[PDB]
Amino acid sequence: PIQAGLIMGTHREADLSLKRVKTMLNDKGYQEVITYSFVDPKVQQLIHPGAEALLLPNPISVEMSAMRLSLWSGLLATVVYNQNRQQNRVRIFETGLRFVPDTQANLGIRQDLMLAGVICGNRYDEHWNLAKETVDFYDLKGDLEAVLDLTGKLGDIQFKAEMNPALHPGQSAAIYLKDERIGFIGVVHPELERKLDLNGRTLVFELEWNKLADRIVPQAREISRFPANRRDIAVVVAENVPAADILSECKKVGVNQVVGVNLFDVYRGKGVAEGYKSLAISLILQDTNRTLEEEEIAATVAKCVEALKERFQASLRD
Amino acid sequence: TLPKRATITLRRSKLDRLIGHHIADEQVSDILRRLGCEVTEGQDEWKAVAPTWRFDMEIEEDLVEEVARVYGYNNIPDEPIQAGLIMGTHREADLSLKRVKTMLNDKGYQEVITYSFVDPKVQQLIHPGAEALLLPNPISVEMSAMRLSLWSGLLATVVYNQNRQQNRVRIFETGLRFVPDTQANLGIRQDLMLAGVICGNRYDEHWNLAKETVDFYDLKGDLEAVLDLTGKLGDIQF
Amino acid sequence: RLAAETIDISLPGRRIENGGLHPVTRTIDRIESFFGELGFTVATGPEIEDDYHNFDALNIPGHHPARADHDTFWFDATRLLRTQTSGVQIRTMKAQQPPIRIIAPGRVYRNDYDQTHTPMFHQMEGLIVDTNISFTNLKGTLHDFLRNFFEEDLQIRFRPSYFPFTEPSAEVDVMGKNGKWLEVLGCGMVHPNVLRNVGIDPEIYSGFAFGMGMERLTMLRYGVTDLRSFFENDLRFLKQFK
Amino acid sequence: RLAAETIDISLPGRRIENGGLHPVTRTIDRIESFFGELGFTVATGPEIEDDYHNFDALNIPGHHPARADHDTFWFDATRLLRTQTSGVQIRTMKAQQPPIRIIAPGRVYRNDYDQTHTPMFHQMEGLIVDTNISFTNLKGTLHDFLRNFFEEDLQIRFRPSYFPFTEPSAEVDVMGKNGKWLEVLGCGMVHPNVLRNVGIDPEIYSGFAFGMGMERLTMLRYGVTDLRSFFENDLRFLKQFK
C-alpha cells in the first residue's frame, strides 16, 4: 500500500451536497432515473421554440441528433415509456447538465448543472381512507419548498407569474430567491399532451443548481418564556391578488410583536360577495422581553390594516 | 529509608522519536543542568539523576517532557502525519445510523437527547415489576435511577414543552438502556435502542387538510419506513 | 372503552412508498465513499470539449490512430463530446501546485450501438500524483479495491495492455465463473509527456491513474446481463434495487 | 378553460415541516466526517465499566488523587459510570494489533452541577498508534483540525498540562475575543505503561491521543452561552439549528 501524508483538506459548512438533496427526494417518494443526454429534434422543438438547438453531424439516427436544451425531453420520453407498459403513477427525477447556445461563453455554449423532475399519476395510491384525487400544483410546490428552501435559504423566495411556451400560464410560477430567475414549476400545457400521448395530468419542475448550493450557518439568540394568543383576521379581497400582498406585508409591520402567520380556511361560499374572497389570516402575537396584553394587540392588528389599505382593500365586518 | 533517586538514562533516539525536532546536544545538556539535575553526557546518551524536590521523575518520558517544556512548545514547527493508506473493510449488507436518522428527521421528526438517569418514582410507573438499577451518592432525589427505557425521559421532555404552550412536538432519541440480567459481561444487559414520541395534530392549520389528531396507523406507517424499505422487509408480522 | 374500543392490528399503515436510486448511481457513490476514506476528493467539469482538452493534452497527438477508434461525436473541427473523463483532471493539474490527488465520475460518449454497447456509459478515472509511488503501489491499491467491492470471492491477474495517456500500462481482469476471465479495469503510470505540458517535473514526481467501467461492474455485481436495460429505465426492473 | 381556470399562485404548498438535528449531534457528525476522511474509523462500547476498564488500565493506578477529582458515580466497589471514553479504545487495542487508529464519541458523567457544568457532557477521545510519529505530527494535525472547524479566524497556543494517561502532555487553547483565551482541547503522547499492559511494544511503537469537549466547541461555534440550555431541550431554541 502507498505512503501518503495525511493532509486534512478544506471543507465548508455553509453549502450543500447533491447526495443530501437526492436522499431527501428518496424520502419524499421519488425514483431516480438516468436518461439519454442527446434527444430528438422533432419533439425537442415542441417544448422550447424560439431558442435554436445544438445540432449534431454524424448522428446515430434521426431520433437522436440534438443536444438538450432542458431536461424535459428524456423525462417525457421515460413517462410515456412506462405508461405504455401498463404501469401507472411514475414519479421520477434526474440530475444532469444542459446545453444552451450563447456567444459570450467558454466554447460557445454555457452549461449549468440542473436538477429536474416529473410527478404525475395518483397522489396517495388507493388507500383505505385517503380518497382518490390526482395531484396538482400546490402539492408540487409544497414538496419542492422542502427540497429548495429548507436545506437552503427560505429567507426571501417569491413566486410570481412568468410565462413559458411549454406549460400553462396560470398553473405555473417562477421562483426567485432575491431577484434572479432560478426555477420553473407547474403542469405542462394541456395541448402539449395531444402529442406524445402522456395519459393523465403530469407535472414538471426544473431548478438551476449552483445558485442554491450555499446554506446559511445558524446563529443563536435570546429566547423568551411567556405564552402567546391566537388572533383571527379575515381580510376581504377581490379575486385578483393571490397571496403577494396578504401574507407578506403582515410581517413587515412591527419588528417586536408579529411572529408567525397561518391560513386555514378560504371564504368563497354564499356569504361573501361574488368576485371577492376572504382569507382567514391567523396570527400568534408575542413580545421578546415581556408578554402581550389586550391593549398593545389592538395597536398591531390595526397598524397592519392601516398598511393594508394601500392594496385597495381592508378588513371585513363580522 | 529516605526517598532515593534513580539513574534516569536518556538516549538520543527516544528524544528524537518523541519530539520530532533536533534539539542540539549543547542545549539539551544545559536544560537539565539549569533545571536542577546532575547531568553527565555519555557519547550519544545522557545519565542524569533526579533532583530531591521533584516527585515526578522516574522514567524517560518524565525526562523528555521537561526538556520539551523548557525548550517551549511554540518553538517547534508543524508537520503532517506520514502513514500508509489501507482501505479498511466495509459492508453493503449493513446499515448506518445516520441514514435512519436522516430519513426520520425528514419524515417530520426531530432528534433530542435527554438525561440518561431518571426519577425512580416515575420510571416505576412505566416499568413496574422489573427492578431498577439504583444509585449510591446521587445528585438529588429525582435523579437516582439508571433508565430501563427511553420513555421516562421522553415523557418528561414532552411535558416540558407542552408547558410552554406548544402542543405539537415530534421528537425522538437514540441511546442505550440498562436492564438487569445475570448473564452479560457485567451484571446488566445493555442494548442500543432507537425510540421516539409523537403527539399533536398530523397536519398543521392548512386550507383543506382537516383537524384530526393522530391514531396508531400513522405511527405504524411511520415505523414501516424505518424498519421496512431500509434494512429488512417481507418477513414482518404484527 | 378499554376492552371495547379496539382496532384491527395488522392492517397496512398509511405512508408513501419510498423509492430507490439507480444501480450505476449506487455504485458510483459506493466507490466514491471507498476512495473518499483514502482522502481522494472528487472533481467535475463540462461535457463538451475542444481538442486541446480531450486529445492533444493526453499526448495522442493527432496523427495517431486514436481519432477514429474512439468513435467520437464531432461538431466541426475543435468541438467534441467528451470521449474519456480526463479533462476534468487536466484542468485541475494545470491550475494548482502539487502534490494533490483526485478522482472523477462522469459521462463519456462513443459511437457504438448494439446489444452490448450503449452510446453512453459512465466511466470513473482516478488520478494520484506525489513523490515515490510505483507499480507495487498500484497493485496494492487496485487489489484492495477489488477485494472490497467484491467480498473475496474472485481472483485477479495483471496483464499488459496499451492506453496512450499512461505508460507503462496494465489490465486487471478479475476471474469470472461462467467463462474464464472478465476484464474489469485498466491502469498504468502517467506518461512523462503528460506531466511536462502541465507544469510538473517528471524527474522528481511520479504517479499513476486508473479507469474503470461502472456498468460492467454493476452488471457483474448485481447479476444483470442485458446492458441495454440500464437506460430504458423500466420501474419494474428498477424497483428491486431499493 | 385556459384563461379562466387559474388558481392562486403564491399560497403555501402542502407538506410536513421537516425538523433538524441537535447541535452536539451535528458537531459530532461533522468532526466524525473530518476525521473519517483521514481514515479514522469510529468505535463504540458500553457506558458502565469496572475499575480495570476505566482507572486501572490507564495507569492511574488507584492511590493517585484521580479517584475523587473525577467526581465519579460509583455503584459498589467495581462498578462506575464511564468517566472518560477510553475503555472503548482499550478494548480495541487489546484484541487486535498494532498499526491502525480509531476515534470514539460517547457520554461521560461527572458529579458537578452548576450554571456552568451539566453532569453529562459528550467527549471525543481520539487514538492513533503506528511507527514514528511525534509531537510535530500532533501539532500538525490538531492545528489543521482547528483551522478546518473554524474558518481561520483564531490563533492557538500550545501550553503544558497533565493528564495521567498521556505523557508528555499539552493543551491547545484557541484565542477568543471576549476574554483572552478559551481552552478548547488537550492532547499528548501515549504513556508507555499504557502500551505495555495491552500488548504493544513501546520500544518500537509510539502514538498520541486527544480529547475534546463537544459542548464547549458547539457553544463557541454557534454563539450559545448558556450550557444548561442544551439539555432542557426547548423546541424554540432547537428549531434554529435546522
UniProtKB/TrEMBL annotation, chain A:
Q: Which residues cross the membrane?
A: none
Q: Where in the cell is it found?
A: Cytoplasm
The UniProt record lists the FDX-ACB domain at 224-317
Q: Where does it primarily localize?
A: cytoplasm
Task: State the UniProt keywords alphabetically.
Answer: Aminoacyl-tRNA synthetase, ATP-binding, Cytoplasm, Ligase, Magnesium, Metal-binding, Nucleotide-binding, Protein biosynthesis, RNA-binding, tRNA-binding
Among the GO biological process terms of this entry, one is: phenylalanyl-tRNA aminoacylation
* Cellular component, GO annotation: phenylalanine-tRNA ligase complex
MF term (GO), any = tRNA binding
The region annotated as signal peptide is: none
Q: Which domain of life is it from?
A: Bacteria
Family the UniProt entry places it in: Belongs to the phenylalanyl-tRNA synthetase beta subunit family. Type 1 subfamily.
Subunit note: Tetramer of two alpha and two beta subunits.
The protein in question is named: Phenylalanine--tRNA ligase beta subunit
State the organism named in the record.
Answer: Salmonella typhimurium
Gene for this chain: pheT
From TrEMBL, chain B:
Cellular localization per UniProt: Cytoplasm
Query: Per UniProt, where does Mg(2+) bind?
Result: 56, 62, 65-66
Residue intervals of the B5 domain:
3-78
* Organism domain of life: Bacteria
The similarity comment for this entry is: Belongs to the phenylalanyl-tRNA synthetase beta subunit family. Type 1 subfamily.
Give the quaternary structure.
Answer: Tetramer of two alpha and two beta subunits.
Q: What is this protein called?
A: Phenylalanine--tRNA ligase beta subunit
The record lists the organism as: Salmonella typhimurium
Q: Which residues of the full protein are shown?
A: 399 to 636 of 795
From TrEMBL, chains C, D:
Cofactors, names only: Mg(2+)
Aminoacyl-transfer RNA synthetases class-II family profile domain ranges (all copies): 31-220
* A single GO molecular function term of this UniProt record: phenylalanine-tRNA ligase activity
Q: How is the cofactor bound?
A: Binds 2 magnesium ions per tetramer.
**So where does Mg(2+) get bound?**
167
List membrane-spanning regions.
Answer: none
Superkingdom of origin organism? Bacteria
Q: Assembly and interactions?
A: Tetramer of two alpha and two beta subunits.
Q: What is this protein called?
A: Phenylalanine--tRNA ligase alpha subunit
Q: Which organism is it from?
A: Salmonella typhimurium
